Write an enzyme that holds these catalytic residues in place. Structure first.
Site, PDB file in Angstrom:
ATOM      1  N   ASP A   1      72.078  79.261  22.445  1.00 40.59           N
ATOM      2  CA  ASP A   1      70.679  79.277  22.824  1.00 40.59           C
ATOM      3  C   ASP A   1      70.581  78.894  24.290  1.00 40.59           C
ATOM      4  O   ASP A   1      69.772  78.023  24.665  1.00 40.59           O
ATOM      5  CB  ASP A   1      69.953  78.262  21.929  1.00 40.59           C
ATOM      6  CG  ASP A   1      68.427  78.359  22.016  1.00 40.59           C
ATOM      7  OD1 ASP A   1      67.862  79.471  22.191  1.00 40.59           O
ATOM      8  OD2 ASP A   1      67.729  77.325  21.868  1.00 40.59           O
TER       9      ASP A   1
ATOM     10  N   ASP B   1      70.374  70.705  24.639  1.00 37.36           N
ATOM     11  CA  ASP B   1      69.926  71.154  23.318  1.00 37.36           C
ATOM     12  C   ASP B   1      70.942  71.957  22.511  1.00 37.36           C
ATOM     13  O   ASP B   1      70.941  73.185  22.502  1.00 37.36           O
ATOM     14  CB  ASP B   1      68.676  71.986  23.431  1.00 37.36           C
ATOM     15  CG  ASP B   1      67.953  72.087  22.106  1.00 37.36           C
ATOM     16  OD1 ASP B   1      68.553  71.720  21.052  1.00 37.36           O
ATOM     17  OD2 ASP B   1      66.776  72.483  22.033  1.00 37.36           O
TER      18      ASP B   1
HETATM   19  C1  LIG Z   1      65.100  69.896  24.119  1.00 37.73           C
HETATM   20  C2  LIG Z   1      65.674  68.806  24.982  1.00 37.73           C
HETATM   21  N1  LIG Z   1      66.785  68.206  24.561  1.00 37.73           N
HETATM   22  C3  LIG Z   1      67.155  67.292  25.467  1.00 37.73           C
HETATM   23  C4  LIG Z   1      68.376  66.495  25.166  1.00 37.73           C
HETATM   24  C5  LIG Z   1      66.281  67.248  26.639  1.00 37.73           C
HETATM   25  C6  LIG Z   1      66.557  66.348  27.668  1.00 37.73           C
HETATM   26  C7  LIG Z   1      67.633  65.459  27.673  1.00 37.73           C
HETATM   27  C8  LIG Z   1      67.829  64.628  28.778  1.00 37.73           C
HETATM   28  N2  LIG Z   1      66.954  64.612  29.792  1.00 37.73           N
HETATM   29  C9  LIG Z   1      65.911  65.487  29.730  1.00 37.73           C
HETATM   30  N3  LIG Z   1      65.037  65.564  30.769  1.00 37.73           N
HETATM   31  C10 LIG Z   1      63.934  66.327  31.016  1.00 37.73           C
HETATM   32  C11 LIG Z   1      63.379  67.299  30.190  1.00 37.73           C
HETATM   33  C12 LIG Z   1      62.238  67.987  30.608  1.00 37.73           C
HETATM   34  C13 LIG Z   1      61.614  67.696  31.819  1.00 37.73           C
HETATM   35  N4  LIG Z   1      60.486  68.327  32.237  1.00 37.73           N
HETATM   36  C14 LIG Z   1      59.874  67.977  33.511  1.00 37.73           C
HETATM   37  C15 LIG Z   1      59.872  69.367  31.428  1.00 37.73           C
HETATM   38  C16 LIG Z   1      62.148  66.709  32.620  1.00 37.73           C
HETATM   39  C17 LIG Z   1      63.299  66.052  32.216  1.00 37.73           C
HETATM   40  N5  LIG Z   1      65.741  66.321  28.703  1.00 37.73           N
HETATM   41  S1  LIG Z   1      65.020  68.356  26.483  1.00 37.73           S
END
Ligand SMILES: Cc1nc(C)c(-c2ccnc(Nc3ccc(N(C)C)cc3)n2)s1
Lengths: 258, 296
Positions: free
Chosen positions: B127, B145
Site C-alpha cells: 500500500d 503504515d
Molecule cells: C497511518 C499512519 N501510521 C503512522 C505510523 C503514521 C505516523 C507515524 C509517525 N509519525 C507520523 N507523523 C505524521 C503524520 C501525519 C502528519 N500530517 C501533518 C498529516 C504529520 C505527521 N505519522 S500515520
C-alpha cells in the site's frame, strides 16, 4: 523475486530459532498431555477444512499454541480456548479475511463465549508479545520446492502431507526446527514418489546433508508407516482429496535405503 | 499512557487515530496510534496484528520505528517515532514550484533502501502511496503504515475485492493475477517517482477498468512480446483497445536520460522483469545523490 530468495531463506533460518517453543514443556504441564495436544491439533485441521483456510494458517496456529504452552499452565478444560484464539490470530495474520469470531465459537460446539475467545486473543498476543510472523514447515518447503528438477505435484502434495503429520505429535517433533522437518519431509516425499534423494541443490542451500537429516527422517518414516493406525486421522482424510492427488493413499516405502 | 500527554490530533483513517504526544518524563515527542478496538465483538483488527508483528521485526533508517505497544483491557496504542508530515501534503504544498530534482532523487533512493530491506525480510508492503511515506526536517523519508503488509514466506494470495488503492495498483493485480509479488511495491514507487516529478498522479483512475486503460494509454496496450502470458490472465480481454506506448520524454519531461531509464524499468509490465529494489539502487540515476532538506 529471487533477488531475495537467498536473503529470505537465510532470514527464515535466523527467525526459526527465535520462534522455537521449549522442547520439554509438556512434562511441566501438570494437567495436559501429548495426547490431548494431538487431539487439539487434529481438530484445528478440521476447522481449517470446514472454513477453507490455507495450510499456512494451521501451521502458524500450532506454532502459537506450543509457544503459549511453553510458559502458561493450562487446564485441560481451557485447551480448546487456547487453540481457538490461536487459530483466530493465525487467521487474521494469514487470511484475506478471517472467519468471524462467532464462527470460531460455533466450531467449538459453543463451549466458550464470544468474550472468552476475545480475552484469550488478548492473552495470547501478550504472551507471544505480538511476535506472530513465525517460520513454518510450510514456508521452508515452499522454498525447497523451487529446486525440483523437474517439478512434480505428487511430491509437493505428499511433502505437505508429511509436514502436517508432524504437527500432531509433539512427541518427537518438538525436537526439530521447521527447516529440518521440511528437509526430511521433502526427501521422504521425493523418495516415496520417485525413488530419488535429497538433491545436491538443497544440500548446498540448506547446508544439510542427507545424513544430518537422518534422525528426523527415521521419525517421520515411522510416523508415515504408522499413519493409518494413528488415533488422529483428520490429516489423512484431508489428503485423500483430488486437490492433493490422493498421496495419503500411496504406499509408504517399507525401507529408506539409508 | 499515564506518561503521555496528547498534544494534537494529526490523523484519522482506516488504521485508527494518530495523535502527536509527548512523554512527560523524558520529553520525547511521539506519534501515538490508537487502534480501533471492539472488545466485545471482533477483537484486535488484522491491521494492528500485521503492522505490529512485522514492524517489530524491521529495523532500518527508512522504515518508521515502532517504539512501544501499550496494550490494556480496553485499549491498544502503538507508539511511533514522530515525523512531521506526509509526502502527500508536501507534494500539495510544493505544487507550482515542484519538489526539487535533487530532493526527489534522495527520497527515491531512501525509499528503495527501505523497500529492499522489507523485501529481503520477506515483507511486502502493498500500500505504498504518498500518504504513507513520512518525512522529517532533516531530509529523511520513511515507509509507514504496515497495516496491509504481508509476510511472504509463502506466496500472498490476492484479494478478490481489493481495498488497496487504485492509483498505485500494479497492472498484474488489475488483470487478475492470483498472487502478489515484490514487484507490486516497485510499481507503486515508480508511480510516486513520476508524481513527484510532474506534480500530478500518473494514473488517477476512477475505477479498475479506467485505471487499467490509463496505464495502457501511457505505456501501450501490452501483448505477449512485452508481457508473456498476458493474454491468458483472468481479466485480460482481446477487446482492450490498442494504444501506443508514449515517449517518456513526454511522460516525465523534467527527467534526464538516467531518470527515464530507471522509471521505465520500475514500470515494466511483466512482474518478472520489473526491476528489483536492490537493483534499482545500483542504477546510475543515483550516482550523484545527496541529502537535501525539504522546505517544510
Ligand atoms: C497511518 C499512519 N501510521 C503512522 C505510523 C503514521 C505516523 C507515524 C509517525 N509519525 C507520523 N507523523 C505524521 C503524520 C501525519 C502528519 N500530517 C501533518 C498529516 C504529520 C505527521 N505519522 S500515520
Amino acid at each position: 523475486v529471487p533477488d531475495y530468495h537467498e536473503d529470505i531463506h537465510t532470514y527464515l533460518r535466523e527467525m526459526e530459532v527465535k520462534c522455537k517453543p521449549k522442547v520439554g514443556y509438556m512434562k511441566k504441564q501438570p494437567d495436559i498431555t501429548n495426547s490431548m495436544r494431538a487431539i487439539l491439533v487434529d481438530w484445528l485441521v478440521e476447522v481449517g477444512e470446514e472454513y477453507k483456510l490455507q495450510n499456512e494458517t494451521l501451521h502458524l496456529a500450532v506454532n502459537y499454541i506450543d509457544r503459549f504452552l511453553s510458559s502458561m499452565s493450562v487446564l485441560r478444560g481451557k485447551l480448546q480456548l487456547v487453540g481457538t484464539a490461536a487459530m483466530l490470530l493465525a487467521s487474521k495474520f494469514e487470511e484475506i479475511y478471517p472467519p468471524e469470531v462467532a464462527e470460531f465459537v460455533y466450531i467449538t460446539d459453543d463451549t466458550y463465549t464470544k468474550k472468552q475467545v476475545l480475552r484469550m486473543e488478548h492473552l495470547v498476543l501478550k504472551v507471544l508479545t505480538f511476535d506472530l510472523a513465525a517460520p513454518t514447515v510450510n514456508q521452508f518447503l515452499t522454498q525447497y520446492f523451487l529446486h525440483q528438477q523437474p517439478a512434480n505435484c505428487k511430491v509437493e502434495s505428499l511433502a505437505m502431507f508429511l509436514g502436517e503429520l508432524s504437527l500432531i505429535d509433539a512427541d518427537p517433533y518438538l525436537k526439530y526446527l521447521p527447516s529440518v522437518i521440511a528437509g526430511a519431509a521433502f526427501h521422504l516425499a521425493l523418495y516415496t514418489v520417485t525413488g530419488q534423494s535429497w538433491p545436491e541443490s538443497l544440500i548446498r542451500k540448506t547446508g544439510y546433508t542427507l545424513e544430518s537429516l537422518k534422525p528426523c527422517l527415521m521419525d517421520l518414516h515411522q510416523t508415515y508407516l504408522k499413519a493409518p493406525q494413528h488415533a488422529q486421522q483428520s490429516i489423512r482424510e484431508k489428503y485423500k482429496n483430488s486437490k492433493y492427488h490422493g498421496v495419503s493413499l500411496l504406499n509408504p516405502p517399507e525401507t529408506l535405503n539409508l | 499512557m499515564e506518561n503521555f500527554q496528547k498534544v494534537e490530533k494529526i490523523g484519522e483513517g482506516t488504521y485508527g487515530v494518530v495523535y502527536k504526544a509527548r512523554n512527560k518524563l523524558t520529553g520525547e515527542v511521539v506519534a501515538l496510534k490508537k487502534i480501533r478496538l471492539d472488545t466485545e465483538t471482533e477483537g484486535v483488527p488484522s491491521t494492528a496484528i500485521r503492522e505490529i508483528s512485522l514492524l517489530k521485526e524491521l529495523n532500518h533508517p527508512n522504515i518508521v520505528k515502532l517504539l512501544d505497544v501499550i496494550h490494556t483491557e480496553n485499549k491498544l496504542y502503538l507508539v511511533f517515532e514522530f515525523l512531521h508530515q506526509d509526502l502527500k501534503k508536501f507534494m500539495d504544498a510544493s505544487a507550482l514550484t515542484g519538489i526539487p530534482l535533487p530532493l526527489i532523487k534522495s527520497y527515491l533512493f531512501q525509499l528503495l533502501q527501505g523497500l529492499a530491506f522489507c523485501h529481503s525480510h520477506r515483507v511486502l508492503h502493498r500500500d505504498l502511496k504518498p500518504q504513507n511515506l513520512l518525512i522529517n526536517t532533516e531530509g529523511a523519508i520513511k515507509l509507514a503504515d504496515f497495516g496491509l503488509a504481508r509476510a511472504f514466506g509463502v506466496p500472498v494470495r490476492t484479494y478478490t475485492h481489493e481495498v488497496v488503492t487504485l492509483w498505485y495498483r500494479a497492472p498484474e493485480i488489475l488483470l487478475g493475477c492470483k498472487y502478489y509479488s515484490t514487484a507490486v511495491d516497485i510499481w507503486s514507487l515508480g508511480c510516486i517517482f513520476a508524481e513527484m516529478v510532474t506534480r500530478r498522479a500518473l494514473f488517477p483512475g476512477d475505477s479498475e477498468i479506467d485505471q487499467l486503460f490509463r496505464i495502457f494509454r501511457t505505456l501501450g496496450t501490452p501483448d505477449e512480446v512485452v508481457w508473456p502470458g498476458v493474454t491468458s490472465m483472468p481479466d485480460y480481454k482481446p477487446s482492450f483497445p490498442k494504444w501506443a506506448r508514449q515517449d517518456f520524454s513526454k511522460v516525465v519531461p523534467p527527467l534526464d536520460e538516467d531518470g527515464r531509464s530507471l522509471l521505465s524499468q520500475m514500470l515494466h509490465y511483466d512482474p518478472n522483469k520489473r526491476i528489483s529494489a536492490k537493483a534499482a539502487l545500483a542504477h546510475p540515476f543515483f550516482q550523484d545523490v545527496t541529502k537535501p532538506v525539504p522546505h517544510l
